[PDB]
From a paper:
The heterodimeric complex IrtAB has been identified as being responsible for the import of the two iron-loaded siderophores (Fe3+-MBT and Fe3+-cMBT) from the periplasmic space into the cytoplasm of Mtb and other mycobacteria. This protein complex is vital for the replication and viability of Mtb in macrophages, which reside in the lung alveoli. Like other ABC transporters, IrtAB contains two transmembrane domains (TMDs) and two nucleotide-binding domains (NBDs), with a single TMD and a single NBD in each of IrtA and IrtB.
Two-dimensional (2D) class averages of full-length IrtAB cryo-EM particle images showed clear features with the SID of IrtA clearly visible in some 2D class orientations. However, there was no SID observed in the final 3D reconstruction of the unliganded protein. The cryo-EM structure of full-length IrtAB without a bound nucleotide resembles the canonical fold of type IV ABC exporters, but its TM region has a partially collapsed inward-facing configuration. The overall fold of Mtb IrtAB is similar to that of the crystal structure of the SID-truncated counterpart from Mycobacterium thermoresistibile (RMSD of 2.38 Å after superimposition of 1,021 Cα atoms). Furthermore, in the cryo-EM map, a strong continuous non-protein density was found at the interface of IrtA and IrtB at the periplasmic side. In the absence of ATP, IrtAB adopts an open-inward conformation, in which, due to TMH6 of IrtB protruding into the central cavity in the TM region, IrtAB represents a low-affinity binding pocket to guarantee unidirectional transport.
Residue numbers in the entry:
A (entry chain A): 276 to 846
B (entry chain B): 4 to 579
The structure:
């Protein structure tokens, strides 16, 4: 509401230049509206003897005023557009440098539209707020105060008389804003649900063309929508009409005419002192209403800044904590673990106290009923998030005491995303080691079964991997797997849900995985029992609380949840 | 070509409202012109004469009051009518729009067309039409009525007004151009950052985030563009109309003072003429104020017009009675490529499916297999071929009798917000409980309809109870199995997790006691096991034909695919 809620916190530097531009805008507005005072003076000059040169001096003053007003406005807009760019540049730089510290889970949380929305929309809205919304607001604020003071200093009768229509407008507005009490939020809810239904209707177009009886839902929703708006706006008609009528420059003219006629005809005041009201003071009504719009113009920029600062105040990864001597009993492999209880969004804990151990060179299967916090346990190992209690240690060194290079030189993950970078295909096959002597690339691609599909390309190894490259899923999943075979990281996280995408081109992906997992510690996130039923050991779990671990037959004949899971009638 | 053709004809409130608006403008005009003689009594030797003209001005302003009230009421009524008409039009027009017009952002535009025009179209006539047009014409009629009393003054304003109009127009255009230049530059700048954020997971894992960051950082910091010509093209957008008005003020005041100094008119009313010029210069300021609302209305109306101007499909004069029994199909080199460049293309597919069999379309990835189903149904148009189901041509047939032959199962399921009973009944508004019962039993969904809390009435819509994959797919299978249309073309939903879904597909395909022509783009060998004639398709053109067993003797490109599917179903993940 007040001085500091993250918004002035973001806008720390823009105070001194902002008040400078504000006082300059007030000055240039007074320079805009002084010509009417000059006109009043010339009018007085006309009724006592004109002469040759006095009016010419007046006109010279007027043209000088015009020139200096234009010069001042130009100076102001130039200074604003100057002061904006430096702040925009610093903001973008700080935003990037913060973007390259966030935990990986944040990106998967946000998505794809969120990032673009945030960056582009908020930077552009902030620029607009700085360059347009502030000067227009301060001008629309200062102008009525000035004209009111000038109208009071020339006469206190007519201004007090003129105040009436303002009272009328205010009371009518306040009486109006009692009938649309809940109607406003109800209409907002209608709007958002209609947006949802519109999105649904559009995304499901083809079905509509075949079964033409599925548009009745959207049709009746649209009918009810328009009926709601119609029934809403019908009452407020006369009230809005009166609200408008008692502002217009017509009624002001008659009011001023009547008051001035009553004053002058009885010799209560000279007639030349009525010129200010015939001049500016008849548009005063419609001028006052502009204040509301000028102030409301700030809302968008304020919300933008709030959102952006809330984002930028995100917490980064943990500190590279106290380095302690490793190897109590462990090896390069053997990724122990201990009472993790990750949780995330506190209230609800998604995992619970687990304590397992991958052998030096054996496989491990994370079977479990889908949705019961099964993949998150694996992603947490690649420092997608930080544990709140307990310690993982690849070997002996807890992942906290490991730089972002010593970590991703011992842990290589393969997940449900592609993540291709914009470059030549040879670079995407050699992102791990940036300089492969153009034959290791070829052997690591002929071991991932992607040699033919990259040879028969438009330009082969050098076609830029654009968004319209002409590729698919398993055709580039093999590209990323070829990239991963060069890394040679002796710990692998293998999301098994990638072997059955585009079920046409999956034999090659299976061969790639076969010759990718050769004597290195794996951890498979299982989705089918028959493919994993022979790895080394099977771990069952339902939202934490590892139910049972051990080998296949052990899990099979114990009466276990494994036995109640592998009996879907053998399917 | 209709940009914003809202009203049907109605002619009546239209002409009446136009005439009323013109008379309401004349009201303020005569108000000011009748103010003209008033001041001549104040700054004079007789200050008592003013009362008569005060009364006349009171009559003028009460007339103005009545007129504005009635025009505002008619305006809100016309706003209601235009809202109704335009939204009904857009809704009823969306379905016939060409199918391939929906891109990833064109869809967003269309979504905005019918989600953000409620409050910005009802309050349109009473906020943009009447004020702007009432303020444009007013200066002209003021000058006109000023002519017969002071022709030296009248002609000055009558010649000045087009200059001020042009100044307003040019200022608005300059502001718009500056804004477009600015936002385009900003987007071109931030594109690099938008890109660097999406590959944030492949970079860190490839232990190369620091150089990849430093590069874009250096580039962005270095580039400046100096913004200077941008400021120079921005400034006139701000300061042009203020200068025009400020100059017109001096011009008019000077001509009035000059006419006073010679002795044509007299002092007591030259002041009245000055006041009248000041009154005449205000509508220009009002129009200058009504810039941003105008721009936003232009934006929204542009959305709506863009939607209302999309290309359409064409169908004419179809002849159907049943299909007679069950249609046979035919192709001729259909060649559908969406531009000739990037796309399915289908350079030379030509076959013939006899009247009623099962037929699978196997083949390597590359969705010619789905555009074939699209062409068969009706959704797309072959750019140079002729699908001739049974003996006619589908392209030269009527729209009403076009979506009345095929019944499609879709690879990506879709259920609209409502009870699942309504979703399944979204194919036949009749369909007594015998049809619905046999349909709900054929597709294995009676299980879902029996283990439901309230039963057959759950509101699935978005974020269903569980309804993940298999369930929605079985609902879609049942719905497409309801329709009587005598050709069923199935699309194998990508879900190799549900043995129930597999058996549902096999049952719907081979156990229906009806008789229809079946086509199933399948990859699960369990499905293509029953298809008695398969079509292999690579790079458009059909590469192989014949029964299953026969192709396993030829030994070409199908024996390999069969032996590759018999192996990628038991791939164990042992490590040795």
């Amino acid at each position: 509401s007040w001085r500091a809620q993250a918004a002035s916190r973001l806008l720390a530097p823009l105070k001194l230049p902002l008040v400078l531009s504000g006082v300059l805008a007030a000055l240039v507005t007074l320079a805009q509206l002084a010509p009417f005072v000059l006109l009043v003076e010339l009018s007085r000059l006309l009724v006592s003897g004109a002469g040759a040169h006095r009016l010419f001096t007046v006109g010279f003053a007027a043209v000088g005023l015009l020139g200096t007003g234009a010069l001042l406005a130009a100076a102001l807009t130039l200074w604003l557009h100057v002061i904006d760019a430096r702040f925009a540049r610093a903001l973008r730089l700080r935003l990037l440098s913060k973007l390259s510290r966030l935990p990986l889970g944040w990106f998967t949380s946000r998505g794809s539209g969120s990032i673009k929305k945030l960056v582009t929309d908020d930077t552009l809205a902030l620029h607009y707020l700085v360059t347009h919304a502030v000067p227009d607001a301060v001008a629309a604020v200062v102008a009525p105060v000035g004209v009111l003071v000038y109208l009071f200093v020339v006469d206190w009768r007519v201004a007090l008389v003129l105040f009436g229509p303002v009272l009328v407008y205010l009371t009518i507005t306040s009486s109006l804003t009692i009938q649309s009490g809940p109607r406003i939020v109800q209409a907002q809810r209608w709007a958002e649900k209609m947006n949802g239904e519109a999105g649904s209707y559009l995304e499901g177009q083809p079905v509509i063309r075949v079964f033409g009886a599925a548009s009745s839902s959207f049709r009746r929703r649209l009918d009810e929508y328009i009926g709601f708006l119609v029934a809403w706006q019908r009452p407020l008609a006369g009230k809005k009409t009166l609200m408008d009528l008692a502002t217009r420059p017509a009624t002001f003219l008659w009011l001023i005419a009547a008051t001035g006629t009553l004053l002058v005809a009885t010799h209560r005041m000279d007639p030349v002192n009525l010129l200010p009201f015939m001049f500016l003071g008849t548009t005063f009504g419609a001028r006052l209403l502009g204040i509301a719009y000028g102030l409301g113009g700030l809302r968008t920029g304020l919300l933008a800044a709030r959102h952006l600062q809330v984002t930028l105040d995100e917490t980064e990864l943990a500190v590279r904590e106290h380095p302690r001597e490793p190897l109590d009993g462990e090896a390069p492999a053997t990724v122990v673990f201990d009472h993790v209880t990750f949780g995330y969004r506190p209230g609800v804990p998604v995992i619970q106290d687990v304590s397992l151990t991958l052998r030096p060179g054996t496989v491990t299967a994370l079977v479990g009923p889908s949705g019961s916090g099964k993949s998150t346990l694996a992603t947490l190992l690649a420092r997608f998030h930080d544990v709140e209690r307990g310690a993982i240690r690849v070997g002996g060194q807890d992942i906290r005491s490991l730089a972002a290079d010593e970590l991703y030189t011992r842990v290589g993950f393969v997940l449900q995303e592609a993540q291709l970078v914009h470059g030549t295909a040879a670079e995407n096959i050699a992102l791990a080691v940036p300089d492969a002597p153009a034959e290791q690339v070829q052997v690591a691609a002929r071991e991932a079964q992607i040699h033919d599909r990259v040879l028969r390309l438009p330009d082969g190894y050098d076609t830029v991997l654009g968004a319209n490259s002409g590729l698919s899923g398993g055709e580039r999943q093999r590209l990323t797997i070829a990239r991963a075979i060069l890394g040679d990281t002796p710990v692998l996280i293998l999301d098994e849900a990638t072997a059955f995408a585009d079920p046409e081109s999956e034999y090659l992906v299976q061969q790639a995985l076969n010759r990718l997992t050769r004597d290195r510690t794996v951890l498979v996130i299982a989705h089918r029992l028959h493919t994993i039923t022979r790895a080394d050991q099977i771990v069952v779990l339902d939202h934490g609380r590892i139910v049972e671990r051990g080998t296949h037959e052990e899990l099979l004949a114990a009466g276990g949840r494994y036995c109640r899971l592998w009996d879907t009638g053998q399917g | 070509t209709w940009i914003a053709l809202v009203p049907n004809d109605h002619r009546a409130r239209l002409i009446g409202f136009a005439l009323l608006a013109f008379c309401s403008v004349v009201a303020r005009a005569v108000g000011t012109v009748l103010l003209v003689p008033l001041m001549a009594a104040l700054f004079g030797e007789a200050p008592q004469r003013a009362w008569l003209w005060l009364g006349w001005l009171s009559a003028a302003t009460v007339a103005g009051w009545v007129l504005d009230a009635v025009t505002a009421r008619i305006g809100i009524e016309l706003g209601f009518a235009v809202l109704n008409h335009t939204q009904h039009d857009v809704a009823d027009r969306l379905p016939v729009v060409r199918l391939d017009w929906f891109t990833a952002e064109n869809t967003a535009t269309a979504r905005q067309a019918i989600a953000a025009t409620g409050p910005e179209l009802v309050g349109l006539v009473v906020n943009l039409v009447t004020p702007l047009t009432s303020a444009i014409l007013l200066p002209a009629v003021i000058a006109l009525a000023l002519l017969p009393i002071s022709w030296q003054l009248g002609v000055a304003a009558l010649a000045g007004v087009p200059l001020l109009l042009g100044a307003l127009w040019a200022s608005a255009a300059f502001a718009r151009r500056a804004d477009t230049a600015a936002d385009k530059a900003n987007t071109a700048l931030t594109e690099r950052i938008i890109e660097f954020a999406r590959t944030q997971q492949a970079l860190r894992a490839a232990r190369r985030v620091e150089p990849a960051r430093s590069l874009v950082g250096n580039a962005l910091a270095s580039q400046h563009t100096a913004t200077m010509r941008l400021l120079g093209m921005q400034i006139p957008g701000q300061l042009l109309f203020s200068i025009a008005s400020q100059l017109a003020l001096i011009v008019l005041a000077g001509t009035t003072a000059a006419l006073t100094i010679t002795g044509t008119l007299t002092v007591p009313e030259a002041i009245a003429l000055i006041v009248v010029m000041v009154r005449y210069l205000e509508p220009f300021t009002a129009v200058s104020e009504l810039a941003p609302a105008l721009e936003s209305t232009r934006a929204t109306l542009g959305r709506i017009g863009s939607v209302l101007t999309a290309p359409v499909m064409v169908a004419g004069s179809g002849t159907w009675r049943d299909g007679a029994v069950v249609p046979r199909i035919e192709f001729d080199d259909v060649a559908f490529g969406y531009d000739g460049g990037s796309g399915p293309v289908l350079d030379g597919v030509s076959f013939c499916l006899q009247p009623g069999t099962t037929t699978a379309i196997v083949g390597p990835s590359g969705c010619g297999k789905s555009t074939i189903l699209a062409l068969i149904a009706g959704l797309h148009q072959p750019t140079r071929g002729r699908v001739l189901i049974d003996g006619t041509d589908v392209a030269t047939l009527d729209a009403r009798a076009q979506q009345a032959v095929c019944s499609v199962v879709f690879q990506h399921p879709y259920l609209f917000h409502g009870t699942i009973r309504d979703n399944v009944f979204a194919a036949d508004p009749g369909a007594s409980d015998d049809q619905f019962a046999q349909a709900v039993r054929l597709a294995r969904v009676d299980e879902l309809i029996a283990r439901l809390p309230d039963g057959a009435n759950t509101i699935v819509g978005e974020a269903g109870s569980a309804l993940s994959g298999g369930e929605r797919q079985r609902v879609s299978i049942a719905r497409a199995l309801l329709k009587a249309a005598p050709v069923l073309l199935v699309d194998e939903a990508t879900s190799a997790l549900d043995a129930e879904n597999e058996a549902a597909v096999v049952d719907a395909l081979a156990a229906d006691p009806r008789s229809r022509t079946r086509v199933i783009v399948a990859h699960r060998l369990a499905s293509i096991r029953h298809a008695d004639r398969v079509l292999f398709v690579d790079d458009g053109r059909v590469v192989e034909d014949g029964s299953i067993s026969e192709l396993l003797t030829a030994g070409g490109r199908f024996s390999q695919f069969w032996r590759q599917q018999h192996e990628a179903a038991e791939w164990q993940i042992l490590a040795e």
